Design a protein around this ligand. Structure first.
Ligand code: ACO
Ligand code: ADP
Length: 658
């Protein structure tokens, strides 16, 4: 009856070149029996995808089941959908419809920073609205009437052979006739960007070098490039002297801009591709700023999906359910900007405002992912501020609660004896700062801040921050962790932030060291910030030398061990403070100490590598090298002042909980 009509609709769907969503909501057993009946009725691959701690290689599947009876992994869901052949069904399993909203989500663990699964009602609420706003999705609920609807047909659709499709062929012509320069092809996932690049390398008379951040499937690109495919990771290409007629970079947005701008000037012609939004995509707002960095950039777009018809209701559902649409970056917010704050409860009563805020926040980031949406919707401790124009959002601020850790735990974190999650900056203040009680303080971290690109540099970004200060109290500080650049820091400095830390680990994506800053609000917060800033000024010279980048603070070259220094050195010597976190102090210890300290001196003063040190000192590896460095620090301290060292060791030793 129902299966027979379902078999007929499938032929139509396959003929129309679309995919569709079939929801099975009911008891687990009931749901499963229906997947059994559905597969033998509609033969196909029926890939099953379910949750726990890939096949999206170039694989395509006919029909699939997504098991969300106990957890909903949004990214996986989105990834699966874009892998289904035309005529495919996406069979989504969900818990009893009336119990869906309050049922814990096993997946929530990956993004809630909670110890146990939490319900995610706002997300479910949103899903139900998309799900029942039209009839495109087939909703099959247990003990509820079921009647396959009848859809007005759409034109016959035909798959791609291998020859470039119309939009590709046209882009291919402009690419092959443009004078020397840079071209960027932007588009939603599945529009044939990687194939276009391969088709290009395949058809030019000259050589071409391709590069990419991680080698994101470069497979499709290689397939169309054929024997002419030549890949070189970004950093090894900058270092090499290799040349080519064309430089082809897909997912160029995920590559550090300074490296990219340098690589491009080496090649007469460059093709940049980047997928916009969706799972693991990049924000449209971010893209605007990215392209702006290439003068005389030729921007091109691709709109037609290649493995399904433009209009597929499955793609529309996923885009709506996960908020991948970004048309707002097209319109310019008008008039006076008005700042206001709101809480996560607004999802339930007025979802359009947090929806629009997410659009802007998501569109301004270099990476887009439904993990963020899940977090904003149901994780606890999230708070928002918005900057509204007459009929559109001009800016938004996303804050998250942090700190309030017990004295005992903070100390444990400081010593590095314990490192649980959540409280990113709070814990970092302790683990990388001088105050073992830094994590007991309360504040809110700036998770994301974004201003519409047509409304930047008018003060809305600073007014957003002013609003956060305005609408909240009983907080020790506002904090922010960001990839460092002089421009971005200057913005935070304006907003009143105080730099308290500069990392030593360049972010793979941005290529920047991570900086941390604080906008203090209580006398305790003010002291943490000044104290930490003073410490950074004493470590500036050592940091700049190690990082290869000067820090923007007045350096204090006073090499004299302080009480502050002794505490940290003891933490390094008798606990688990990281070597680099103790860089400034260790260097000051080494300047005063008369001891050989080969492991510390070799690494910090003579540019020896870990491998070389291990061989010269005959250690088994990095682990023992570090243990030896801690023992050397202890010796140096004892050789300077035995009793002070013993008291410090005794004190920090006890901070180990359990
Ligand atoms: C994790 C964290 O969220 S990290 C940081 C990331 N978010 C951003 O990547 C998105 C990209 N950028 C934007 O959307 C922006 O340019 C924002 C957040 C960084 C700033 O907002 P804007 O509205 O342009 O800020 P605003 O105009 O209020 O800047 C105000 C103060 O900062 C200065 N400033 C602002 N932008 C910049 C910039 N790009 N370079 C240098 N200085 C700047 C100011 O002019 C002003 O001080 P002033 O009174 O002397 O003029
Ligand atoms: N002209 C074409 N002919 C045949 N298959 C194609 C063609 N263009 C793209 N494809 C295939 O369709 C899909 C789109 O891949 P892709 O080009 O990498 O789009 P995107 O870069 O936006 O993710 C892949 O499975 C690819 O192999």
């Amino acid at each position: 009856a129902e299966l027979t009509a379902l078999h007929t609709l499938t032929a139509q769907m396959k003929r129309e070149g679309i995919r569709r969503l079939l929801v099975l909501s009911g008891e687990e057993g009931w749901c499963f029996e229906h997947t059994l009946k559905l597969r033998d009725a509609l033969p196909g691959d029926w890939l099953w995808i379910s949750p726990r701690p890939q096949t999206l290689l170039g694989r395509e599947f006919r029909h699939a089941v997504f098991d969300a009876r106990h957890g909903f992994d949004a990214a996986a869901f989105a990834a699966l959908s874009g892998t289904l052949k035309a005529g495919s069904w996406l069979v989504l399993l969900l818990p009893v419809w009336e119990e869906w909203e309050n049922q814990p989500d096993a997946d929530s663990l990956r993004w809630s920073d909670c110890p146990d699964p939490i319900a995610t009602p706002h997300f479910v609420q949103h899903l139900k609205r998309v799900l029942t706003a039209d009839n495109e999705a087939i909703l099959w609920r247990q003990n509820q009437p079921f009647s396959l609807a009848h859809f007005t047909p759409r034109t016959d659709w035909y798959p791609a052979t291998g020859a470039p499709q119309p939009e590709q062929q046209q882009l291919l012509k402009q690419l092959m006739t443009m004078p020397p320069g840079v071209a960027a092809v932007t588009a939603a996932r599945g529009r044939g960007k990687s194939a276009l690049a391969g088709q290009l390398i395949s058809r030019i008379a000259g050589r071409a070098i391709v590069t990419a951040p991680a080698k994101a499937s470069t497979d499709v690109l290689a397939q169309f490039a054929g024997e002419k495919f030549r890949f070189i990771a970004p950093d090894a290409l900058l270092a090499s002297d290799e040349q080519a007629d064309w430089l082809v970079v897909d997912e160029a947005a995920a590559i550090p801009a300074p490296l990219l701008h340098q690589l491009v000037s080496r090649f007469p012609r460059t093709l940049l591709t980047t997928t916009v939004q969706g799972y693991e995509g990049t924000g449209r707002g971010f893209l605007l700023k990215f392209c702006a960095r290439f003068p005389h950039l030729h921007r091109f777009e691709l709109q037609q999906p290649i493995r399904w018809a433009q209009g597929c209701p499955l793609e529309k559902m996923v885009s709506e359910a996960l908020v991948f649409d970004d048309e707002n970056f097209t319109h310019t917010p008008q008039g006076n900007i008005v700042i206001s704050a709101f809480e996560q409860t607004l999802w339930q009563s007025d979802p359009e405002t947090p929806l629009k805020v997410y659009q802007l926040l998501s569109g301004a980031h270099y990476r887009t992912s439904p993990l963020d949406l899940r977090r904003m919707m149901d994780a606890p401790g999230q708070h928002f501020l918005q900057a509204a124009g007459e009929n559109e959002i001009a800016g938004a601020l996303w804050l998250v609660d942090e700190g309030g850790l017990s004295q005992q735990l903070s100390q444990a974190v400081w010593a590095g004896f314990r490192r649980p999650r959540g409280n990113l900056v709070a814990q970092s203040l302790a683990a990388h700062g001088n105050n073992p009680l830094a994590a007991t303080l309360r504040g809110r971290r700036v998770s994301r801040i974004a201003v519409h690109p047509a409304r930047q540099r008018e003060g809305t970004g600073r007014q957003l921050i002013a609003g956060a200060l305005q609408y909240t109290q009983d907080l020790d500080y506002l904090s922010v962790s960001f990839g460092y650049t002089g421009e971005l820091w200057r913005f935070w400095q304006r907003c009143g932030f105080v730099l308290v830390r500069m990392g030593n680990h360049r972010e793979a994506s941005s290529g920047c060291y991570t900086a941390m800053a604080l906008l203090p609000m209580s006398d305790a917060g003010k002291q943490l910030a000044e104290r930490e800033h003073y410490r950074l000024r004493r470590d500036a010279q050592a940091l700049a030398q190690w990082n290869g980048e000067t820090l923007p603070v007045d350096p204090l070259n006073d090499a004299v061990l302080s009480d502050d220094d002794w505490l940290e050195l003891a933490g390094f010597a008798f606990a688990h403070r990281p070597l680099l976190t103790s860089l400034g102090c260790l260097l000051r210890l080494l300047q005063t100490s008369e001891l050989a300290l080969p492991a510390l001196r070799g690494r910090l003063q003579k540019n020896a590598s870990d491998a070389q040190l291990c061989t010269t000192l005959k250690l088994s590896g990095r682990k023992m090298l570090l243990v030896r460095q801690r023992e050397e620090a202890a010796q140096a301290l004892f050789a300077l002042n035995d009793v002070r060292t013993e008291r410090l060791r005794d004190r920090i030793t006890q901070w180990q909980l359990f």
